[PDB]
Write a protein that binds this ligand. Structure first.
Ligand SMILES: CC(=O)N[C@@H]1[C@@H](O)[C@H](O[C@@H]2O[C@H](CO)[C@@H](O[C@@H]3O[C@H](CO)[C@@H](O[C@@H]4O[C@H](CO)[C@@H](O)[C@H](O)[C@H]4NC(C)=O)[C@H](O)[C@H]3NC(C)=O)[C@H](O)[C@H]2NC(C)=O)[C@@H](CO)O[C@H]1O
Ligand SMILES: CC(=O)N[C@@H]1[C@@H](O)[C@H](O[C@@H]2O[C@H](CO)[C@@H](O[C@@H]3O[C@H](CO)[C@@H](O[C@@H]4O[C@H](CO)[C@@H](O)[C@H](O)[C@H]4NC(C)=O)[C@H](O)[C@H]3NC(C)=O)[C@H](O)[C@H]2NC(C)=O)[C@@H](CO)O[C@H]1O
Length: 243
């Protein structure tokens, strides 16, 4: 299903420079791990028309490519050939432990960005771990050391609604109906609101933002490679964050 939408050759063309010496994650991210992870989430790249499936895969890889980018405008083959360069948040400044009864933080552990989606916060490591059958509150480092677990956490985030946010998967496959609150916030279906779902607090609703732009650059390149249109509403420059 994922392999029916994106081949090993297409995966490598997209993630062209991930195994450069300039990349910390060199050798970590493999096509096999990506495919293995996708087996845990049967709807991913397998929901809707062939175009919707292509957008699902392209948007996933584009958003995650930005999360982990080592790109620069004048980098070899352009900024959008340098996704999946990192696997751990650079100079992570925080524990990212927001106390709650639901997701207790493990002593001495930190929930900074790890893996393709740069999964952060105890409140994401908790449910991600539960979904994949691995205790990620106690062993968050596993997101940075096991490639299959790494991709699975990213797909978990992609596929999972967290009210009032829909899943990014639902958005990109055209299965999301904005609420009245969404309409008032200027959140229309498209790649843009996915950026908002992932990191809208820091990136959205304040006009031009180079991180938002970077995500779109990867998306357009990956859509061109798979042979699919981008859809509408690619940015979140004028979207209020979800909270
Ligand atoms: C003046 C000049 O041209 N200098 C060159 C440098 O720009 C260049 O180094 C590269 O610089 C870009 C920014 O310009 C940098 O891009 C950033 O990459 C990080 C790491 O992936 C991203 O951080 C993620 O952000 C998201 C939020 O958006 C977090 O959720 C996530 O946790 C973060 N991930 C990690 C792993 O920490 C930044 O978002 C991204 N910035 C932007 C604006 O997109 C590249 O990583 C730099 N590349 C390298 C290899 O360090 C340098 C090399 O080309 O050359 C200088 O001359
Ligand atoms: C400093 C820095 O660079 N940090 C980056 C991280 O912030 C980023 O991880 C993403 O972080 C945002 C928060 O900024 C997070 O989004 C939050 O998600 C929670 C849980 O879904 C929401 O909390 C719920 O809100 C509703 C109301 O809206 C409540 O009813 C409900 O009870 C809340 N649940 C809990 C458990 O508190 C937040 O509202 C929401 N905030 C925003 C602004 O959207 C994302 O999930 C994080 N994304 C990921 C992939 O982890 C990370 C990745 O970009 O990079 C760090 O560098």
């Amino acid at each position: 299903s994922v392999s029916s939408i994106i081949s090993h050759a297409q995966f490598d063309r997209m993630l062209l420079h991930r195994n450069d010496g300039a990349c910390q994650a060199k050798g970590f991210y493999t096509y096999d791990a990506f495919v293995a992870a996708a087996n845990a989430f049967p709807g991913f790249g397998a929901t809707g028309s062939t175009d919707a499936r292509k957008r699902d895969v392209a948007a996933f890889l584009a958003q995650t490519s930005h999360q982990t980018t080592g790109g620069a405008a004048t980098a070899p083959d352009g900024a959008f050939a340098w996704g999946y360069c990192f696997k751990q948040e650079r100079g992570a400044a925080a524990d990212y432990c927001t106390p709650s009864a639901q997701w207790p933080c493990a002593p001495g552990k930190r929930y900074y960005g790890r893996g393709p989606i740069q999964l952060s916060h105890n409140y994401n490591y908790g449910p991600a771990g539960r979904a994949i059958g691995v205790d990620l509150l106690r062993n968050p480092d596993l997101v940075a050391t096991d490639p299959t677990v790494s991709f699975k956490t990213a797909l978990w985030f992609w596929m999972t609604a967290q009210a009032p946010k829909p899943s990014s998967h639902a958005v990109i496959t055209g299965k999301w109906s904005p609420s009245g609150a969404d309409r008032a916030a200027g959140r229309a279906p498209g790649f843009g609101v996915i950026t908002n779902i992932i990191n809208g607090g820091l990136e959205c609703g304040h006009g031009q933002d180079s991180r938002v732009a970077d995500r779109i650059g990867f998306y357009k390149r990956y859509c061109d490679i798979l042979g699919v249109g981008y859809g509408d509403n690619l940015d979140c420059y004028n979207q209020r964050p979800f909270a």
